[PDB]
């Protein structure tokens, strides 16, 4: 029986509504049609990312190996939360257990926003810090840039030492993986900028349809971070 269960979470990747059942060594993502049992040892990284609208949060779980849904491979689990939603949790464990098990990181009875509770429980169980944005300031106080990638609109987050784009497909690129970056501008009167990244392995990523105001914030970031610009 589970330590706790988070019900009816909005998953973006893979898309659907899933319960997350929390066990000592794995989580169970349980939906109507599919389910996946995911050992914590397969979780590489955790991210908590504020949507630019200030009303939603992404929770991103990086996986290796990926989960398989037919021929589709998902290297990330992405959950989407309203900042508003609240939850009360009662861990299916006695009080003294939890203190020993989690080094005092959790208590038996907990209350808070759903996104914070999921992040806290995941943090404790995987024994990993949550990756958040650093000090990047975008346009109008957003910590991300709105852009298109592979013909889908999404959000690019400049992190302390990397970039992550959500959600279709998600992309995480560490600074140490980057060969160079470049900027290009088209002739449209809006959404005219492209930001391109080439990795050391030769892979290329283009984030396009970037507004000029956001391009300017991204430009300062890339320079502040001393990334190599190739014109
Ligand atoms: Cl523009």
Give the residue ranges of DSSP H helices in the chain. 95-101, 114-126, 212-224
Last residue of one domain, picked from the residues 132, 164, 194: 132
Last residue of a domain, one of 109, 132, 155: 132
Experimental method: X-ray
Q: Distance from the CA of 27 to the center of ligand 1, in angstroms? A: 43
Peptide bond into 167 cis (omega under 30): yes
CA of 209 to the centre of ligand 1 (A): 8
Decide if 185 contacts 198 (C-beta within 8 A).
Answer: no
Angle at 136 between CA 130 and CA 140, to 5 degrees: 115
Neighbours of 107 (CB within 10 A): 12
How many angstroms does the Cα of residue 14 sit away from the middle of ligand 1? 32
Tell whether 197 and 102 lie within a shared domain: no
Tell me the Ramachandran region of residue 226: left when phi exceeds 0, alpha when psi lies from -120 to 50, beta otherwise: left
17 CA to middle of ligand 1, Å?
36
| Ligand 1 centroid, distance to 215 Cα (angstroms) | 8
Q: Write the CA distances from 46 to 58, 81, 96, 121, 222, integer angstroms.
A: 11, 15, 27, 12, 23
In a 10 Å sphere around its CB, with 0-12 CB exposed, 13-18 middle and 19+ buried, how is residue 87 labelled? Answer: middle
DSSP 69: E
Whose tokens are 């759903």? That residue is 114
Specify whether 106 is located in the same domain as 50.
yes
Structurally, how many domains does the chain consist of? Answer: 2
Query: Could you give the CA distance from residue 27 to residue 124 in angstroms, rounded to a whole number?
Result: 13
What's the gap in Å between 198 CA and the centre of ligand 1?
A: 23
Q: 109 is written with which tokens?
A: 């009875």
Task: Say if CB 30 and CB 8 are below 8 A apart.
Answer: no
Q: According to the 3-state scheme, what is the secondary structure of 10-33?
A: EEEECEEEEEEEECCCEEEEECCC
> Does 67 lie in the same domain as 7?
yes
**In Å, how far from its chain's centre is CA 170?**
8
List Cα–Cα distances, 75 to 23, 90, 161, 171, 224, in angstroms.
21, 30, 20, 9, 30
What is the rounded distance in angstroms from the CA atom of residue 76 to the CA atom of residue 72?
Answer: 12
């Amino acid at each position: 029986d589970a330590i706790c269960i988070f019900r009816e979470l909005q998953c973006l990747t893979p898309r659907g509504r899933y319960d997350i059942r929390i066990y000592p060594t794995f989580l169970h993502l349980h939906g109507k049609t599919f389910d996946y049992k995911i050992p914590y040892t397969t979780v590489l990284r955790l991210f908590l990312l504020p949507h630019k609208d200030q009303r939603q949060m992404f929770f991103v779980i990086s996986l290796d190996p990926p989960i398989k849904q037919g021929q589709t491979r998902y290297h990330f689990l992405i959950l989407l939360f309203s900042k508003d939603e609240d939850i009360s949790l009662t861990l299916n464990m006695n009080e003294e257990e939890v203190e020993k098990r989690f080094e005092g990181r959790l208590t038996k009875n907990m209350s808070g926003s759903l996104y914070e509770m999921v992040s806290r429980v995941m943090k404790a169980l995987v024994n990993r810090k949550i990756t958040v944005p650093g000090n990047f300031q975008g346009h109008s106080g957003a910590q991300c840039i709105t852009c298109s990638y592979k013909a889908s609109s999404g959000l690019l987050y400049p992190l302390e030492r990397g970039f992550i784009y959500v959600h279709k497909p998600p992309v995480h690129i560490r600074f140490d993986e980057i060969s160079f970056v470049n900027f290009a501008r088209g002739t449209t009167t809006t959404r005219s900028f492209d930001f391109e990244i080439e990795t050391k392995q030769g892979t290329q990523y283009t984030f396009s349809s970037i507004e000029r105001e956001e391009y300017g914030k991204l430009f300062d970031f890339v320079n502040a971070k001393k990334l190599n610009i190739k014109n």
